[PDB]
Amino acid sequence: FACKTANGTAIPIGGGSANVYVNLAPVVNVGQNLVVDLSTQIFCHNDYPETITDYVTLQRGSAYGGVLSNFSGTVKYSGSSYPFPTTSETPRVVYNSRTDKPWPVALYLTPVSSAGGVAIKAGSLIAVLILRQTNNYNSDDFQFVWNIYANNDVVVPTGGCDVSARDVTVTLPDYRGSVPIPLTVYCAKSQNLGYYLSGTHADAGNSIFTNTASFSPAQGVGVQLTRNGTIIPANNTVSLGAVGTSAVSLGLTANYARTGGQVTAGNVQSIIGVTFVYQ
Amino acid sequence: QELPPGTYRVDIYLNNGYMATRDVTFNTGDSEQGIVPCLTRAQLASMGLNTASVAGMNLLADDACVPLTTMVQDATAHLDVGQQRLNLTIPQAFMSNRARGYIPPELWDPGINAGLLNYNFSGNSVQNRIGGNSHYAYLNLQSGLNIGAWRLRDNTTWSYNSNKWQHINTWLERDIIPLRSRLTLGDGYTQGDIFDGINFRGAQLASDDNMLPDSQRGFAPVIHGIARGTAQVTIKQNGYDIYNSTVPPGPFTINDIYAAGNSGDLQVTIKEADGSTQIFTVPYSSVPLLQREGHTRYSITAGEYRSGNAQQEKPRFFQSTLLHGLPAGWTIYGGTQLADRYRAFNFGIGKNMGALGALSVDMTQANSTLPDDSQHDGQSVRFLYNKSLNESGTNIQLVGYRYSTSGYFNFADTTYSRMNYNLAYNKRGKLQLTVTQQLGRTSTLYLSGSHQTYWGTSNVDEQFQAGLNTAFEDINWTLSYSLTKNAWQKGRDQMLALNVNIPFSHWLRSDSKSQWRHASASYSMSHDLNGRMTNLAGVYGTLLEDNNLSYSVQTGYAGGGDGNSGSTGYATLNYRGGYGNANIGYSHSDDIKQLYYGVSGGVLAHANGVTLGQPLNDTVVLVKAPGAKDAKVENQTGVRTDWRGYAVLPYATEYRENRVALDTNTLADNVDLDNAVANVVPTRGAIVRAEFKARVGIKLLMTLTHNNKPLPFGAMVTSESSQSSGIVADNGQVYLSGMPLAGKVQVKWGEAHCVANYQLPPESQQQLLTQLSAECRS
Amino acid sequence: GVALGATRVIYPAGQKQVQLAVTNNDENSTYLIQSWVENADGVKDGRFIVTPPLFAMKGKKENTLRILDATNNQLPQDRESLFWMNVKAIPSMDKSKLTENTLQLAIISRIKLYYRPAKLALPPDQAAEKLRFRRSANSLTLINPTPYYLTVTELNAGTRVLENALVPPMGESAVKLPSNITYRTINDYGALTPKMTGVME
């Protein structure tokens, strides 16, 4: 038994180790996938096909470099599927000819959510796969140690941040009272976040929001937001600095506000916009 | 201040995460607020609590109020009437399903019933120097049936030489989810962990790692700690940050660290509310047999030994193995192996020892009958040592030593028919070794060797391979040496090798649209230090707009040694397409001259017909999108829907969520989909549908006006001619797909109103999206 | 909540469309998603159409927004043009809390859309180096001779971190306060480039 690759390398009878270099999808989003098909890359054959049958397994598979820290997924071997990095030996593929045929191995990988920037450096070792070879003739047991390198960078683009709903429709207390608003923002990858308020105003200062209630609207009364006791006007950008996976609270409290004449009876409802401006 | 007892309409939160809204009874209790919520074991368990991890909770009645604060150390309840909010905190150590990537078992789809075939038709033509010609053909058939959760599979090949149907394999498999295991009947194999792997026909029940979240797989240290208040837990390894989450007050157990058994020490840091920390390091080396704390790997097998060696019998046998992960990084394990002519018992201990590295030691007691009917007793001990990456850049990947007494044998040894391979000369001692060494940022020294003594002879089996591998920018450079001195032969065997890899990507502008950016040059030499030298220059990469086509071309020349000189040439094309794969290969060895040609692919027979594609991989996603014809599937090279809108995906990951998207760029101009993204959660071997709804017809952005004033926001718009409908946004605009050239449109916001008609001039067909205005009723 | 797949979208000229992911991870929530493209001033000038402009979205779901080029080559061919992509997540209004007092919040993601002309003579991953500076009285001015918008971040005049800056293609931008200057930038993938030493006119 002996093997060779699509790049310049080879392993002879008895076994050994060799490097394999493969191109990769340059850009993979979180929740998307990456294939590393080595069946186009590694080719093996049987030296004595008239008298001996060769059994070839993927004994072990380990992730290194950017694949180890930034990815996970599976390894396909001759139709069957296993976790990668591996936790077990696969079954056997039979080799019964002198004429080279592919080693049926391919990796299927997904970025983890912490993954961002350059998740795989060009030229870096990404995986070691051990081909194990025995036969139906004697006690021969040889390891063929394939080292896999990436021929290019792989990038995992940063995504938007999530502003956790908490409460969708916030109930306000009876007039005169005020509620703090639960509104936190976290990012899968740390970045600088600015937000501002927007909506229809009664006042010139741009701080009180119209009573949008469709049925039985009350006059002379609006909805006004505060951050640590301070009134926040709409279209004025609060900076939050760097936001990571620890949910940062916007610090909003909902106060009733007086707009015009006598405060009338009736329901009060508002819809406000919190806009997050990404760099 | 205390509150008066009573019933409160409240939003129940556990560890800052919403659970449910109910009315909760509060009774006077030992508490800061004077009152305690009444919650049941039922209610607490479903909210995330792991009841058995808390002493006494099994004793209470079904509806008994749990004394949460006395029964659970550091558990807290606060009520806020102001937000109508009940905030509970229970230390995560008592919480279940803490793992990241966790997916509830009941979402695991067993998949549809289907028929399943993989075909590989391949052949090659040889032209020999003296002798003439030769033609070879080979056909591989991988056969399959899915009924519910069962997977029947078959392997059979056909041969030709200038020929027989030689069948290979069959098994019926199923997963048992409550046991997190896999049942396999038929041809299967055993693992080589404890006893040598055996090929066999029979039954196997085995635990399956695949079913665990990736974050829990393999061995990693499980960190136990206490957080005074609400705390931030961060871990670093190999310099870079590898873990980060917030934890409640009280004890916490982190069983979530990704296996990285060679990457180095874990630096844990626990940042508290006030800003004070706990900074400690958890060392982390690992040997393959170690189990993560509280994990059990087991296997039970019974069947007949089917090695494929004709000079061997087929003895019935029983084998079971068990490996268990304990606290403090301990592992106990062992197994048994019973057969008519062989019985064996193994037992082992193993530990992540921390600073000294990682070690396992096991012992095998073997009682054996050889083919000459003589009886033997023997033992075998094996030490496995690992030390993960140093501060000094040393990684002692594996040190191994096995030692066997005279009478020691393996099951395989007894399966033979005749004594004479030779059973008088069984192996004595074996030392394995693999070490790597960092040498600056860019280089890596690699040493690996093995040494085998025997009983009878003084003949050894030496073997040694050193290697140096340097990065120079993009370029990888490798020099390597190997020396192998076998037992039953004379004289050294050597190989000296050098390889250089130059990718062209970073040689051109990053916008470059040229295909050279997907190409690399390679140069390499061999020299067997016995006269023979070879060398090879080559080019390899991918071609076409989707990179379905792979090529390798390389010419070189080998000369000396055996007295055989002359130039060589090798080429390969490789195509991954919509309906299968194709290969061509070409080889020229100065004497031999040969051609390779092959077609491969997958077939699926299902409720909605037969769909073809690239060969299949156990777990199959079936894209079902009637009306989306040449539609590309994202992240799957060459995978396109057929002339019906069906595809079979070669690649999916079991027991996880799988994004399955259609590339909307590749859609026909008159096609839009209700949803361009589907999401699936298949079991291993499962065949799952990913459904997309295609609206085929004109796409239009309509400005709808009424008394020269645009229709209001939120207006429901619905067609008379097609099944399509929309909502009016700003400027009175609505978007509509799958529309006819001319038609009537029904609009309704208050309670039917306006009705509009249109007629697009035929000439607007080629267009993506045409904009027209329409008046209304009244 | 509702989250976008990316934090900026590069539009290559000559492409029919570009995709932008929209994900909802709230299992119980239903949103009315409303998306629109403005120019540098805030006007929805219809130079880019996003489809679907408005649609319902329930539970855990990803959908794809299709951004169609409707410029007809009107935009400059020697520089990037700035547009803004806006995605408004309008919470679903309940009849269950009509006769009560309620506040609703609409989350809007607002991200840059760049119209990138084909054949720019300068590759993007080389633009960040060409930045030039000018310290005066109070203001430091960033000068950008490249055809690419620069999202200059972590700008330092000593240990004093300044305002971030968006620097126009072949134009300039200034910040405040009266070292040596160091900066990073944010690339097409929403990632920080390495730290560079500011170069003076």
PDB file of C-alpha atoms in Angstrom, chain A residues 31-245:
ATOM      1  CA  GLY A  31     -24.447  29.551  10.753  1.00  0.00           C
ATOM      2  CA  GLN A  32     -23.100  28.653   7.309  1.00  0.00           C
ATOM      3  CA  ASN A  33     -20.687  25.845   6.349  1.00  0.00           C
ATOM      4  CA  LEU A  34     -17.311  24.938   4.908  1.00  0.00           C
ATOM      5  CA  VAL A  35     -16.281  21.796   2.975  1.00  0.00           C
ATOM      6  CA  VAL A  36     -12.777  20.303   2.842  1.00  0.00           C
ATOM      7  CA  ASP A  37     -12.946  17.464   0.320  1.00  0.00           C
ATOM      8  CA  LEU A  38      -9.657  15.599   0.335  1.00  0.00           C
ATOM      9  CA  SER A  39     -10.903  12.855  -1.981  1.00  0.00           C
ATOM     10  CA  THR A  40      -9.920  15.101  -4.875  1.00  0.00           C
ATOM     11  CA  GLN A  41      -6.559  15.557  -3.097  1.00  0.00           C
ATOM     12  CA  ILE A  42      -5.363  12.189  -1.757  1.00  0.00           C
ATOM     13  CA  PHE A  43      -4.988   9.008  -3.833  1.00  0.00           C
ATOM     14  CA  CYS A  44      -3.938   5.507  -2.717  1.00  0.00           C
ATOM     15  CA  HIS A  45      -3.462   1.992  -4.187  1.00  0.00           C
ATOM     16  CA  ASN A  46      -2.737  -1.665  -3.402  1.00  0.00           C
ATOM     17  CA  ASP A  47       0.718  -3.073  -4.184  1.00  0.00           C
ATOM     18  CA  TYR A  48      -0.302  -6.764  -4.348  1.00  0.00           C
ATOM     19  CA  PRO A  49      -3.981  -6.825  -5.520  1.00  0.00           C
ATOM     20  CA  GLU A  50      -3.761 -10.410  -6.826  1.00  0.00           C
ATOM     21  CA  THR A  51      -3.072 -11.928  -3.403  1.00  0.00           C
ATOM     22  CA  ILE A  52      -3.714  -9.238  -0.738  1.00  0.00           C
ATOM     23  CA  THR A  53      -6.652  -6.989   0.212  1.00  0.00           C
ATOM     24  CA  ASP A  54      -5.946  -3.662   1.948  1.00  0.00           C
ATOM     25  CA  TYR A  55      -8.159  -2.150   4.682  1.00  0.00           C
ATOM     26  CA  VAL A  56      -7.996   1.605   5.143  1.00  0.00           C
ATOM     27  CA  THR A  57      -9.600   3.546   7.998  1.00  0.00           C
ATOM     28  CA  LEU A  58      -9.565   7.107   9.280  1.00  0.00           C
ATOM     29  CA  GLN A  59      -8.138   6.132  12.657  1.00  0.00           C
ATOM     30  CA  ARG A  60      -8.013   9.606  14.151  1.00  0.00           C
ATOM     31  CA  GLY A  61      -8.704  13.184  13.126  1.00  0.00           C
ATOM     32  CA  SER A  62      -7.623  16.316  14.952  1.00  0.00           C
ATOM     33  CA  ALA A  63      -8.256  20.011  14.409  1.00  0.00           C
ATOM     34  CA  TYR A  64      -5.432  22.529  14.724  1.00  0.00           C
ATOM     35  CA  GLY A  65      -4.977  26.295  14.359  1.00  0.00           C
ATOM     36  CA  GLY A  66      -7.980  28.323  13.291  1.00  0.00           C
ATOM     37  CA  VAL A  67     -10.151  25.243  12.715  1.00  0.00           C
ATOM     38  CA  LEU A  68      -9.543  24.086  16.291  1.00  0.00           C
ATOM     39  CA  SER A  69     -10.365  27.440  17.880  1.00  0.00           C
ATOM     40  CA  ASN A  70     -13.019  28.781  15.478  1.00  0.00           C
ATOM     41  CA  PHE A  71     -14.886  25.805  13.985  1.00  0.00           C
ATOM     42  CA  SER A  72     -16.591  22.510  14.657  1.00  0.00           C
ATOM     43  CA  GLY A  73     -18.484  19.913  12.631  1.00  0.00           C
ATOM     44  CA  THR A  74     -18.222  16.485  11.079  1.00  0.00           C
ATOM     45  CA  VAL A  75     -16.005  14.242   8.973  1.00  0.00           C
ATOM     46  CA  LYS A  76     -17.512  12.172   6.179  1.00  0.00           C
ATOM     47  CA  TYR A  77     -15.734   8.984   5.319  1.00  0.00           C
ATOM     48  CA  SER A  78     -16.883   6.772   2.441  1.00  0.00           C
ATOM     49  CA  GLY A  79     -20.530   7.728   2.931  1.00  0.00           C
ATOM     50  CA  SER A  80     -20.703   7.546   6.734  1.00  0.00           C
ATOM     51  CA  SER A  81     -20.653  10.516   9.128  1.00  0.00           C
ATOM     52  CA  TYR A  82     -18.659  11.098  12.370  1.00  0.00           C
ATOM     53  CA  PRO A  83     -17.865  14.005  14.747  1.00  0.00           C
ATOM     54  CA  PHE A  84     -14.716  16.079  14.049  1.00  0.00           C
ATOM     55  CA  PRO A  85     -12.406  16.328  15.852  1.00  0.00           C
ATOM     56  CA  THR A  86     -12.905  12.581  15.901  1.00  0.00           C
ATOM     57  CA  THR A  87     -13.617  10.468  18.973  1.00  0.00           C
ATOM     58  CA  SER A  88     -13.327   7.069  17.267  1.00  0.00           C
ATOM     59  CA  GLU A  89     -11.994   5.001  14.352  1.00  0.00           C
ATOM     60  CA  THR A  90     -14.177   4.793  11.246  1.00  0.00           C
ATOM     61  CA  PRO A  91     -15.027   1.586   9.419  1.00  0.00           C
ATOM     62  CA  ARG A  92     -12.837   0.135   6.621  1.00  0.00           C
ATOM     63  CA  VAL A  93     -12.681   1.016   2.937  1.00  0.00           C
ATOM     64  CA  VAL A  94     -11.327  -1.889   0.845  1.00  0.00           C
ATOM     65  CA  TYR A  95      -8.459  -1.369  -1.611  1.00  0.00           C
ATOM     66  CA  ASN A  96      -8.122  -4.161  -4.183  1.00  0.00           C
ATOM     67  CA  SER A  97      -6.375  -2.590  -7.217  1.00  0.00           C
ATOM     68  CA  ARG A  98      -2.941  -1.298  -8.194  1.00  0.00           C
ATOM     69  CA  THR A  99      -4.575   1.661  -9.915  1.00  0.00           C
ATOM     70  CA  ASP A 100      -4.930   4.718  -7.662  1.00  0.00           C
ATOM     71  CA  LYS A 101      -8.332   5.729  -6.293  1.00  0.00           C
ATOM     72  CA  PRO A 102      -9.341   8.589  -3.945  1.00  0.00           C
ATOM     73  CA  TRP A 103      -9.323   8.322  -0.155  1.00  0.00           C
ATOM     74  CA  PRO A 104     -13.002   9.172   0.565  1.00  0.00           C
ATOM     75  CA  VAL A 105     -12.633  11.826   3.258  1.00  0.00           C
ATOM     76  CA  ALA A 106     -14.141  15.291   3.478  1.00  0.00           C
ATOM     77  CA  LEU A 107     -14.691  17.745   6.320  1.00  0.00           C
ATOM     78  CA  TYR A 108     -17.887  19.692   6.918  1.00  0.00           C
ATOM     79  CA  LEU A 109     -17.352  22.657   9.268  1.00  0.00           C
ATOM     80  CA  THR A 110     -19.303  25.468  10.955  1.00  0.00           C
ATOM     81  CA  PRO A 111     -17.978  28.619  12.623  1.00  0.00           C
ATOM     82  CA  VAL A 112     -18.747  29.099  16.343  1.00  0.00           C
ATOM     83  CA  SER A 113     -20.419  32.404  17.345  1.00  0.00           C
ATOM     84  CA  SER A 114     -17.227  33.798  18.909  1.00  0.00           C
ATOM     85  CA  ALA A 115     -15.636  33.495  15.448  1.00  0.00           C
ATOM     86  CA  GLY A 116     -14.820  36.786  13.695  1.00  0.00           C
ATOM     87  CA  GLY A 117     -12.073  38.434  11.652  1.00  0.00           C
ATOM     88  CA  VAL A 118      -9.625  35.997  10.085  1.00  0.00           C
ATOM     89  CA  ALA A 119     -10.742  32.608  11.365  1.00  0.00           C
ATOM     90  CA  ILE A 120      -8.108  30.680   9.350  1.00  0.00           C
ATOM     91  CA  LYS A 121      -4.676  32.168   8.548  1.00  0.00           C
ATOM     92  CA  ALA A 122      -3.348  31.309   5.089  1.00  0.00           C
ATOM     93  CA  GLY A 123      -0.539  28.732   5.323  1.00  0.00           C
ATOM     94  CA  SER A 124      -1.601  27.430   8.733  1.00  0.00           C
ATOM     95  CA  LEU A 125      -1.983  23.798   9.786  1.00  0.00           C
ATOM     96  CA  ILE A 126      -5.711  23.141  10.099  1.00  0.00           C
ATOM     97  CA  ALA A 127      -5.946  19.383  10.727  1.00  0.00           C
ATOM     98  CA  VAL A 128      -4.005  16.144  11.039  1.00  0.00           C
ATOM     99  CA  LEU A 129      -5.737  13.050   9.668  1.00  0.00           C
ATOM    100  CA  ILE A 130      -4.301   9.596  10.308  1.00  0.00           C
ATOM    101  CA  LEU A 131      -4.965   6.954   7.656  1.00  0.00           C
ATOM    102  CA  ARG A 132      -4.644   3.478   9.161  1.00  0.00           C
ATOM    103  CA  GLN A 133      -3.775   0.558   6.894  1.00  0.00           C
ATOM    104  CA  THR A 134      -3.901  -3.178   7.559  1.00  0.00           C
ATOM    105  CA  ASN A 135      -4.566  -6.194   5.327  1.00  0.00           C
ATOM    106  CA  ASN A 136      -6.267  -9.609   5.140  1.00  0.00           C
ATOM    107  CA  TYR A 137      -2.927 -11.372   4.746  1.00  0.00           C
ATOM    108  CA  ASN A 138      -0.682 -10.626   7.730  1.00  0.00           C
ATOM    109  CA  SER A 139      -0.321  -8.374  10.775  1.00  0.00           C
ATOM    110  CA  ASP A 140       0.692  -5.200   8.893  1.00  0.00           C
ATOM    111  CA  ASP A 141      -0.603  -2.065  10.659  1.00  0.00           C
ATOM    112  CA  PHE A 142       0.645   1.214   9.177  1.00  0.00           C
ATOM    113  CA  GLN A 143      -0.263   4.826   9.864  1.00  0.00           C
ATOM    114  CA  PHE A 144      -0.342   7.343   7.011  1.00  0.00           C
ATOM    115  CA  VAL A 145      -0.235  10.770   8.696  1.00  0.00           C
ATOM    116  CA  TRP A 146      -1.770  13.543   6.589  1.00  0.00           C
ATOM    117  CA  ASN A 147      -1.229  17.140   7.653  1.00  0.00           C
ATOM    118  CA  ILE A 148      -3.710  19.597   6.166  1.00  0.00           C
ATOM    119  CA  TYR A 149      -2.849  23.208   5.401  1.00  0.00           C
ATOM    120  CA  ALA A 150      -5.023  26.072   4.147  1.00  0.00           C
ATOM    121  CA  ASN A 151      -3.835  27.837   0.969  1.00  0.00           C
ATOM    122  CA  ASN A 152      -5.800  31.015   1.780  1.00  0.00           C
ATOM    123  CA  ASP A 153      -7.493  33.091   4.487  1.00  0.00           C
ATOM    124  CA  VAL A 154     -10.973  32.261   5.699  1.00  0.00           C
ATOM    125  CA  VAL A 155     -13.016  35.146   7.039  1.00  0.00           C
ATOM    126  CA  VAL A 156     -16.085  35.101   9.280  1.00  0.00           C
ATOM    127  CA  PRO A 157     -17.853  38.469   8.808  1.00  0.00           C
ATOM    128  CA  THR A 158     -19.200  40.207  11.906  1.00  0.00           C
ATOM    129  CA  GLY A 159     -22.973  40.337  12.259  1.00  0.00           C
ATOM    130  CA  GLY A 160     -25.497  42.657  13.852  1.00  0.00           C
ATOM    131  CA  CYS A 161     -26.124  42.863  17.577  1.00  0.00           C
ATOM    132  CA  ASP A 162     -29.250  41.634  19.276  1.00  0.00           C
ATOM    133  CA  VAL A 163     -31.465  43.851  21.368  1.00  0.00           C
ATOM    134  CA  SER A 164     -33.216  41.283  23.538  1.00  0.00           C
ATOM    135  CA  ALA A 165     -36.984  41.879  23.508  1.00  0.00           C
ATOM    136  CA  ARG A 166     -37.665  41.205  27.210  1.00  0.00           C
ATOM    137  CA  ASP A 167     -41.131  42.735  27.011  1.00  0.00           C
ATOM    138  CA  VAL A 168     -42.646  43.285  23.550  1.00  0.00           C
ATOM    139  CA  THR A 169     -45.612  45.454  24.624  1.00  0.00           C
ATOM    140  CA  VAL A 170     -44.704  47.290  27.860  1.00  0.00           C
ATOM    141  CA  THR A 171     -47.594  48.049  30.249  1.00  0.00           C
ATOM    142  CA  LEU A 172     -47.557  51.491  31.862  1.00  0.00           C
ATOM    143  CA  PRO A 173     -48.930  52.178  35.358  1.00  0.00           C
ATOM    144  CA  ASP A 174     -51.918  54.447  36.009  1.00  0.00           C
ATOM    145  CA  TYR A 175     -51.243  58.132  35.354  1.00  0.00           C
ATOM    146  CA  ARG A 176     -48.633  59.929  37.512  1.00  0.00           C
ATOM    147  CA  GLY A 177     -46.460  56.781  37.866  1.00  0.00           C
ATOM    148  CA  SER A 178     -43.491  55.555  35.795  1.00  0.00           C
ATOM    149  CA  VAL A 179     -41.914  52.213  34.728  1.00  0.00           C
ATOM    150  CA  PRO A 180     -38.273  51.378  34.065  1.00  0.00           C
ATOM    151  CA  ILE A 181     -37.902  49.736  30.618  1.00  0.00           C
ATOM    152  CA  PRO A 182     -36.052  46.410  30.280  1.00  0.00           C
ATOM    153  CA  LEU A 183     -33.971  46.821  27.117  1.00  0.00           C
ATOM    154  CA  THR A 184     -30.553  45.199  26.814  1.00  0.00           C
ATOM    155  CA  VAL A 185     -28.219  44.834  23.854  1.00  0.00           C
ATOM    156  CA  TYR A 186     -25.530  42.186  23.317  1.00  0.00           C
ATOM    157  CA  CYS A 187     -23.250  41.368  20.386  1.00  0.00           C
ATOM    158  CA  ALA A 188     -21.855  37.994  19.295  1.00  0.00           C
ATOM    159  CA  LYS A 189     -18.667  39.975  18.598  1.00  0.00           C
ATOM    160  CA  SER A 190     -17.560  43.071  20.555  1.00  0.00           C
ATOM    161  CA  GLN A 191     -18.156  46.393  18.774  1.00  0.00           C
ATOM    162  CA  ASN A 192     -19.056  50.073  19.438  1.00  0.00           C
ATOM    163  CA  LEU A 193     -22.787  50.850  19.558  1.00  0.00           C
ATOM    164  CA  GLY A 194     -24.724  54.119  19.366  1.00  0.00           C
ATOM    165  CA  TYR A 195     -28.504  54.459  19.611  1.00  0.00           C
ATOM    166  CA  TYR A 196     -31.050  57.280  19.269  1.00  0.00           C
ATOM    167  CA  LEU A 197     -34.830  57.701  19.750  1.00  0.00           C
ATOM    168  CA  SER A 198     -37.287  58.603  16.980  1.00  0.00           C
ATOM    169  CA  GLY A 199     -41.013  59.248  16.658  1.00  0.00           C
ATOM    170  CA  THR A 200     -43.759  61.859  16.548  1.00  0.00           C
ATOM    171  CA  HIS A 201     -43.479  64.758  19.008  1.00  0.00           C
ATOM    172  CA  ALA A 202     -45.806  67.213  20.658  1.00  0.00           C
ATOM    173  CA  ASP A 203     -42.975  69.492  21.862  1.00  0.00           C
ATOM    174  CA  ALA A 204     -40.383  71.700  20.149  1.00  0.00           C
ATOM    175  CA  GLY A 205     -37.637  70.352  22.430  1.00  0.00           C
ATOM    176  CA  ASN A 206     -38.292  66.982  20.788  1.00  0.00           C
ATOM    177  CA  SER A 207     -38.782  64.899  23.955  1.00  0.00           C
ATOM    178  CA  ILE A 208     -42.453  64.002  24.451  1.00  0.00           C
ATOM    179  CA  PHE A 209     -44.044  61.324  22.283  1.00  0.00           C
ATOM    180  CA  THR A 210     -47.579  61.624  20.906  1.00  0.00           C
ATOM    181  CA  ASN A 211     -50.432  59.629  22.397  1.00  0.00           C
ATOM    182  CA  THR A 212     -50.852  57.170  19.511  1.00  0.00           C
ATOM    183  CA  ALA A 213     -53.777  55.272  21.121  1.00  0.00           C
ATOM    184  CA  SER A 214     -56.460  54.765  18.476  1.00  0.00           C
ATOM    185  CA  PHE A 215     -59.483  54.367  20.779  1.00  0.00           C
ATOM    186  CA  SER A 216     -60.351  56.895  23.511  1.00  0.00           C
ATOM    187  CA  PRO A 217     -57.177  59.046  23.361  1.00  0.00           C
ATOM    188  CA  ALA A 218     -56.378  61.280  26.349  1.00  0.00           C
ATOM    189  CA  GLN A 219     -55.274  64.864  25.696  1.00  0.00           C
ATOM    190  CA  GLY A 220     -52.541  66.926  27.329  1.00  0.00           C
ATOM    191  CA  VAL A 221     -50.474  63.828  28.101  1.00  0.00           C
ATOM    192  CA  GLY A 222     -47.514  62.059  26.449  1.00  0.00           C
ATOM    193  CA  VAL A 223     -44.685  59.571  26.988  1.00  0.00           C
ATOM    194  CA  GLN A 224     -41.165  60.709  27.866  1.00  0.00           C
ATOM    195  CA  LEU A 225     -37.993  58.682  28.384  1.00  0.00           C
ATOM    196  CA  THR A 226     -35.248  59.144  31.015  1.00  0.00           C
ATOM    197  CA  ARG A 227     -31.710  57.773  31.537  1.00  0.00           C
ATOM    198  CA  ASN A 228     -30.584  58.055  35.173  1.00  0.00           C
ATOM    199  CA  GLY A 229     -33.039  60.915  35.857  1.00  0.00           C
ATOM    200  CA  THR A 230     -32.248  62.832  32.635  1.00  0.00           C
ATOM    201  CA  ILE A 231     -34.759  63.505  29.842  1.00  0.00           C
ATOM    202  CA  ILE A 232     -33.647  61.964  26.521  1.00  0.00           C
ATOM    203  CA  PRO A 233     -34.752  63.771  23.353  1.00  0.00           C
ATOM    204  CA  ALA A 234     -35.353  61.936  20.074  1.00  0.00           C
ATOM    205  CA  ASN A 235     -32.688  62.091  17.328  1.00  0.00           C
ATOM    206  CA  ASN A 236     -29.910  62.518  19.893  1.00  0.00           C
ATOM    207  CA  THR A 237     -27.251  59.778  19.788  1.00  0.00           C
ATOM    208  CA  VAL A 238     -26.382  58.062  23.059  1.00  0.00           C
ATOM    209  CA  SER A 239     -23.043  56.257  22.761  1.00  0.00           C
ATOM    210  CA  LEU A 240     -22.756  52.912  24.578  1.00  0.00           C
ATOM    211  CA  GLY A 241     -19.080  52.180  23.847  1.00  0.00           C
ATOM    212  CA  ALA A 242     -17.990  48.590  23.186  1.00  0.00           C
ATOM    213  CA  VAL A 243     -20.735  45.972  23.525  1.00  0.00           C
ATOM    214  CA  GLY A 244     -19.838  42.295  23.836  1.00  0.00           C
ATOM    215  CA  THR A 245     -21.775  39.217  24.927  1.00  0.00           C
TER     216      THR A 245
END
